[PDB]
RNA sequence: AGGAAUUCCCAGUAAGUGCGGGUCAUAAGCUUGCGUUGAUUAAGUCCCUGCCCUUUACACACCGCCCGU
RNA sequence: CGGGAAACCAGAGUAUGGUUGUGAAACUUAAAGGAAUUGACGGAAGGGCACCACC
C-alpha cells in the first residue's frame, strides 16, 4: 500500500516538469497556426 | 395503466440522469459555432471532433425539441391546460382545521375539498392519478392552528414540504362577505436564487391562466427564507391612485424539503434539497435569495 | 450541574451563549405598508 | 425517541429553559443538538433534537 | 464598414453558388 | 348531559374503538400513521345569500334587433 | 557536388479583481393639469354555479 502511495508522488512531480518543458515548445506551434488564419479563406 | 405509469417513470428518470451531459454537449457546440462565424482558432478542446459538431450544426433546426429539462417534463401541461387541485387533511381533523381547509378551496380556482376518513395515503394518490388530479394538498394542524402544508404534483412531480407560522383565517374576522372567485393575477417577489426560482415555479403552476381585466391579486413575497401569502382586490378610483382591500387568509411559509417523487414514495424518492439546521454555518445562511 | 447551583440563579447571571437558528419574523404595520407599496407598484406598471 | 431526546439535570425550573431556548448543545460523543421546548412533568427538563 | 466582417459574408454567399455538395466540401476545408 | 347565537359535514362518508412511530421542519396532557365496526337524508332549483360569464363552424329543424346617459 | 547549429561570421481560453468611459420647489396628486371618430359609466335580460346559498 505504501509502495503504491510512494509511487503516486513522482507522477505528480513528473507531470509538473512535463507541462513546463512542453510550454516552451507550445509557443512555436501557436505562431505557425497564425499563418493558417490568413490562408484559411484562400486555402 | 399501472404498467404504463411505471414505464413513464423510468423514462422520466432516465432523461433526468442524462440532462447534464446534453447541456455540456450543447455548450461545446455553440463555442465551435462562434469560432466558425467569426474567423478564429478552434478551441484546443474543440480541435478534435470539430467535424462531427459541424455536421451536427447542419442537422439542428427549430423542429427539434432541443435539450431536455426535468422541470419541463414534470410541468408538461402547465400552460395548455388548467390545473386540477384537491385538498385533504390529516386523519380526524380538528374543528378549525376543517375551517382552514374550506378557505383554501376558495383561494385556488377550481379546487375541491374532500373528507379524509380511513383512507390510506397510497390509495388517495391512486384515485387522484386515475381521475386526472393535477396537484394534491395536505394540511396539518397543532392545537387547532395549521402548522404544515404539503404540495405534491401527481404525475411523478416534485413534492414540497412547508411549515406555517402566522395563520389568520377569514372565519376569525367578522362580517367580511364573499370572495371574488375570479382567476387571479400572481405577484412573485424576492425569489432570486436558483432554488427560489424552483420554489416559485411550484406555487405559480397551482393557478390557471387569468384574464387581463381581472382585479384579483395574490402575492408571494420572500424575506429571509420566509414566504408571505397575501390576497388582495384593487379598485382604480382614479388614475395613478389605487385602493387595496385585504381579503382571504394570511399566513407564512418556510420550505424545508423537496423530493422528486410523489408523497406516496417517501421511502424511495430522492431529495433534491433539504434544510440542514445543525450545519456549523446554518444560522447565517439563506437559500431562497442571493 | 443544577444540583450544585441555587434555584433560579442563572436568571440574573447574564451569561453569553449562541443560538442555533434565526428567529421567526414578527409582523407589524410597517411591514404591511411596505408590502402593499410593492403590490401597488406592480399594479400601476401591469408588472404581472 | 430517535433524534429527539428528553434531557434532565441541566436546569431546575421552567423559567430557566425559556431563557435558553434555541441554544446550541452537544454531547461528549460530538453529536450537536438544539434546545426546543420545556417539559412540565419534571421541574427543569426540556426537549432537544 | 469593416472589411473583415464583409469578407466573410461575401464568401458565404459565393460558395452557395457552387452547389450544396460543393458548399459542404469547401466548408470542411475552412474548418 | 350543557341556553341564545354560531361552525362544520354526502359513502367506507358522520360517529365509536384499539394498536404503533417520533422519522434533519412542527409536534409532549400533544402530532402523525395503520387497522376494526359502520349508518339517516339527498342525486335538484335559483325563491333568499352570493359567484362566474354573455346580449353580434349558416346540414335539417328552430329562431328573427337589449336599453339609456 | 559541398554545408545546414556538434553551422556560420566577427499560442490560446475561462475565472477573479481595479481604473475609467428666470429657477419644479421653500410650493403641486386638478394626468404641473391630459388623450378621445379610439374615452367614462348606468340599467335590464339570458346562460351557469355553490354544504361563502337554498331543501
Ligand atoms: Mg371521524
Ligand atoms: Mg374512523
Ligand atoms: Mg351535547
Ligand atoms: Mg382513535
Swiss-Prot record, chain B:
Could you tell me which residue ranges the Brix domain spans? 83-264
Q: Name one Pfam family in it.
A: Brix
Give its localization.
Answer: Nucleus, Nucleolus
A cellular-component GO term for this protein: small-subunit processome
Q: Name one GO biological process term.
A: maturation of SSU-rRNA
UniProt key word rRNA processing: yes
Among InterPro entries, the record links this protein to: Brix, IMP4/RPF1
Which Gene Ontology molecular-function terms are recorded? Answer: rRNA primary transcript binding; snoRNA binding
Q: What Gene3D superfamilies would the database entry show?
A: Probable brix-domain ribosomal biogenesis protein (3.40.50.10480)
Q: Which UniProt keywords apply?
A: Nucleus, Ribonucleoprotein, Ribosome biogenesis, rRNA processing
Q: How does it assemble?
A: Part of the small subunit (SSU) processome, composed of more than 70 proteins and the RNA chaperone small nucleolar RNA (snoRNA) U3. Component of a heterotrimeric complex containing IMP3, IMP4 and MPHOSPH10. Interacts with MPHOSPH10.
Stated role: Component of the 60-80S U3 small nucleolar ribonucleoprotein (U3 snoRNP). Required for the early cleavages during pre-18S ribosomal RNA processing. Part of the small subunit (SSU) processome, first precursor of the small eukaryotic ribosomal subunit. During the assembly of the SSU processome in the nucleolus, many ribosome biogenesis factors, an RNA chaperone and ribosomal proteins associate with the nascent pre-rRNA and work in concert to generate RNA folding, modifications, rearrangements and cleavage as well as targeted degradation of pre-ribosomal RNA by the RNA exosome.
What's the protein here called?
U3 small nucleolar ribonucleoprotein protein IMP4
Q: Which organism is it from?
A: Homo sapiens
Swiss-Prot record, chain C:
Report quaternary structure and partners.
Answer: Part of the small subunit (SSU) processome, composed of more than 70 proteins and the RNA chaperone small nucleolar RNA (snoRNA) U3. Component of a heterotrimeric complex containing IMP3, IMP4 and MPHOSPH10. Interacts with IMP3 and IMP4.
Tell me the residues linked by Glycyl lysine isopeptide (Lys-Gly) (interchain with G-Cter in SUMO2): 4
Would you say which domain of life the source belongs to?
A: Eukaryota
**Shown residues in whole-protein numbering:** 391 to 438 of 681
In what way is this protein post-translationally modified?
Phosphorylated in M (mitotic) phase.
Which family is this protein grouped under?
Belongs to the MPP10 family.
Q: Which organism is it from?
A: Homo sapiens
Per UniProt, subcellular location reads as: Nucleus, Nucleolus; Chromosome
- In Swiss-Prot or TrEMBL terms, this protein is called U3 small nucleolar ribonucleoprotein protein MPP10
Q: What is the lineage of its organism?
A: Eukaryota, Metazoa, Chordata, Craniata, Vertebrata
According to its UniProt entry, the function of this protein is described as: Component of the 60-80S U3 small nucleolar ribonucleoprotein (U3 snoRNP). Required for the early cleavages during pre-18S ribosomal RNA processing. Part of the small subunit (SSU) processome, first precursor of the small eukaryotic ribosomal subunit. During the assembly of the SSU processome in the nucleolus, many ribosome biogenesis factors, an RNA chaperone and ribosomal proteins associate with the nascent pre-rRNA and work in concert to generate RNA folding, modifications, rearrangements and cleavage as well as targeted degradation of pre-ribosomal RNA by the RNA exosome.
UniProtKB/Swiss-Prot annotation, chain E:
Q: Which domain of life does the UniProt lineage start with? A: Eukaryota
Q: What does this protein do?
A: Part of the small subunit (SSU) processome, first precursor of the small eukaryotic ribosomal subunit. During the assembly of the SSU processome in the nucleolus, many ribosome biogenesis factors, an RNA chaperone and ribosomal proteins associate with the nascent pre-rRNA and work in concert to generate RNA folding, modifications, rearrangements and cleavage as well as targeted degradation of pre-ribosomal RNA by the RNA exosome. Prevents helicase DHX37 to be recruited before post-A1 state.
This protein is called what?
40S small subunit processome assembly factor 1
Kindly list the positions at which N6-acetyllysine occurs in this protein.
20
Residue ranges crossing the lipid bilayer per the database entry: none
Where can this protein be found? Answer: Chromosome; Nucleus, Nucleolus
Q: What's the subunit arrangement here? A: Part of the small subunit (SSU) processome, composed of more than 70 proteins and the RNA chaperone small nucleolar RNA (snoRNA) U3.
Amino acid at each position: 500500500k505504501e509502495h503504491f502511495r510512494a509511487k503516486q508522488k513522482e507522477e505528480e512531480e513528473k507531470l509538473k516538469r512535463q507541462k513546463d518543458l512542453r510550454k516552451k515548445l507550445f509557443r512555436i506551434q501557436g505562431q505557425k497556426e497564425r499563418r493558417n488564419q490568413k490562408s484559411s479563406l484562400k486555402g | 395503466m399501472l404498467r404504463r405509469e411505471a414505464r413513464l417513470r423510468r423514462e422520466y428518470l432516465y432523461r433526468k440522469a442524462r440532462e447534464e451531459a446534453q447541456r455540456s454537449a450543447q455548450e461545446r457546440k455553440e463555442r465551435l459555432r462562434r469560432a466558425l462565424e467569426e474567423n478564429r482558432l478552434i478551441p484546443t478542446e474543440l480541435r478534435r471532433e470539430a467535424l462531427a459538431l459541424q455536421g451536427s450544426l447542419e442537422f439542428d433546426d427549430a423542429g427539434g425539441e432541443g435539450v431536455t429539462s426535468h422541470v419541463d417534463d414534470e410541468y408538461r401541461w402547465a400552460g395548455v391546460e388548467d390545473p386540477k387541485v384537491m385538498i385533504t387533511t390529516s386523519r380526524d381533523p380538528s374543528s378549525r382545521l376543517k375551517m382552514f381547509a374550506k378557505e383554501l378551496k376558495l383561494v385556488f380556482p377550481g379546487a375541491q375539498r374532500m373528507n379524509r376518513g380511513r383512507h390510506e395515503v397510497g390509495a388517495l394518490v391512486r384515485a387522484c392519478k386515475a381521475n386526472g388530479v393535477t396537484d394534491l394538498l395536505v394540511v396539518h394542524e397543532h392545537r387547532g392552528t395549521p402548522v404544515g402544508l404539503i404540495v405534491s404534483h401527481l404525475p411523478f412531480g416534485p413534492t414540497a414540504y412547508f411549515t406555517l407560522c402566522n395563520v389568520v383565517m377569514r372565519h376569525d374576522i367578522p362580517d367580511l362577505g364573499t370572495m371574488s372567485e375570479a382567476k387571479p393575477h400572481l405577484i412573485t417577489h424576492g425569489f432570486s436564487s436558483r432554488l427560489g426560482k424552483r420554489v416559485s415555479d411550484i406555487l405559480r403552476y397551482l393557478f390557471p391562466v387569468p384574464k387581463d381585466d381581472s382585479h384579483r391579486v395574490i402575492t408571494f413575497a420572500n424575506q429571509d427564507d420566509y414566504i408571505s401569502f397575501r390576497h388582495h382586490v384593487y379598485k382604480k378610483t382614479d388614475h395613478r391612485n389605487v385602493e387595496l382591500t385585504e381579503v382571504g387568509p394570511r399566513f407564512e411559509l418556510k420550505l424545508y424539503m423537496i423530493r422528486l417523487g410523489t408523497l406516496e414514495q417517501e421511502a424511495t424518492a430522492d431529495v433534491e434539497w433539504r434544510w440542514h439546521p445543525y450545519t456549523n454555518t446554518a444560522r447565517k445562511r439563506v437559500f431562497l435569495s442571493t | 450541574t443544577a444540583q450544585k447551583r441555587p434555584e433560579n440563579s442563572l436568571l440574573e447571571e447574564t451569561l453569553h451563549f449562541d443560538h442555533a437558528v434565526r428567529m421567526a419574523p414578527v409582523i407589524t404595520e410597517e411591514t404591511t405598508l411596505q408590502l402593499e407599496d410593492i403590490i401597488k407598484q406592480r399594479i400601476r406598471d401591469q408588472a404581472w | 425517541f430517535k433524534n429527539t431526546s428528553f434531557i434532565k439535570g441541566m436546569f431546575n425550573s421552567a423559567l430557566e429553559v425559556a431563557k435558553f431556548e434555541g441554544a446550541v448543545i452537544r454531547t461528549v460523543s460530538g453529536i450537536r443538538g438544539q434546545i426546543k421546548k420545556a417539559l412540565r412533568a419534571p421541574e427543569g427538563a426540556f426537549r432537544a433534537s | 464598414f469593416n472589411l473583415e466582417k464583409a469578407r466573410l459574408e461575401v464568401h458565404r454567399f459565393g460558395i452557395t453558388g457552387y452547389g450544396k455538395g460543393k458548399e459542404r466540401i469547401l466548408e470542411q476545408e475552412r474548418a
